[model samples]
Target: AALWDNVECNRHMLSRYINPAKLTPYLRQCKVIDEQDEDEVLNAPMLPSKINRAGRLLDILHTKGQRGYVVFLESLEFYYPELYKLVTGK
Candidate 1:
């Protein structure tokens, strides 16, 4: 009984990412299709959307580039030297 309780408690804290294969097939599919043809899509098996690789890459690059200026300033230790000293000193 104690073992069962321990197992049940452990399962509750289990994250979805720990063992993806264990969760992959067990998840309920919930995909939103076109509202006009929603009924037809509902009747069909829902599949995950195929994301655009190029679009995703572009978004990631934009975020990295925006941070690049801050990174460059820090790397040179030329900007906000006092603020950097305050952090690094501690």
Candidate 2:
């Protein structure tokens, strides 16, 4: 719910900030999320994610076993091996 709400909030702000008329043309030029662009995001190659907001959050909480931190760290290592290497000094 929070994620969806955030998207809605951002959309509202962006619509006003960008002026829908201008934003539509920008997206159209890039073919982003249009009906004709059936796989604008899903078909794109998954790239290596370096440190960012989500990664930083997960890194901060990577030591909790009873509190579910251990599981999260394991996942980080699995998905972001480069980040895990930095954390472990490997």
Candidate 3:
């Protein structure tokens, strides 16, 4: 969970991203989240649409813990490679 803790600290920066749903399918397949959760976050009706969705996505991802953290990092790498590198440093 050490890495996840670091990710928690860095998570605020993720809101700057517009479409966090890019990671959802992968996370669902990996059991980190559900299609239903993805649906809501994608729809994510609220003010500051992008930030709202991003926060919701991260909220769901947060509960998945260690495995979710790893999968999220991998999925983030797929879509946000530079950010992935920044987090994993590998």
Backbone clashes, each candidate: 0, 1, 0
Arrange candidates, best TM-score first. 3, 2, 1
Off by over 4 Å in 3: 46-52
lDDT of 2 by residue, 17-85 (tens): 221232223333443324333233223343453222132222222222223333432443555465445
Q: Clashes in model 2: which pairs? A: 64-69
TM-score (all chains, Cα) for each model: 0.18, 0.30, 0.80
- Better TM-score candidate (2, 3): 3
Best by lDDT: 3
Worst 10 residues of 2 by lDDT: 50-59
Best by TM-score: 3
Which scores better on TM-score, 1 or 3?
A: 3
Worst 10 residues of 3 by lDDT: 44-53
Report each candidate's C-alpha RMSD, comma-separated, in the order given: 20.7, 16.4, 2.1
Off by over 4 Å in 1: 15-17, 20-90
In the range 1-90, model 1's lDDT, one tens digit per residue, is 332232223332222112222221212121111232333323433235322212222222223342432342242233335433432442
Report lDDT per candidate.
Answer: 0.28, 0.33, 0.75
Question: Candidate 2 lDDT (Cα, whole model)?
Answer: 0.33
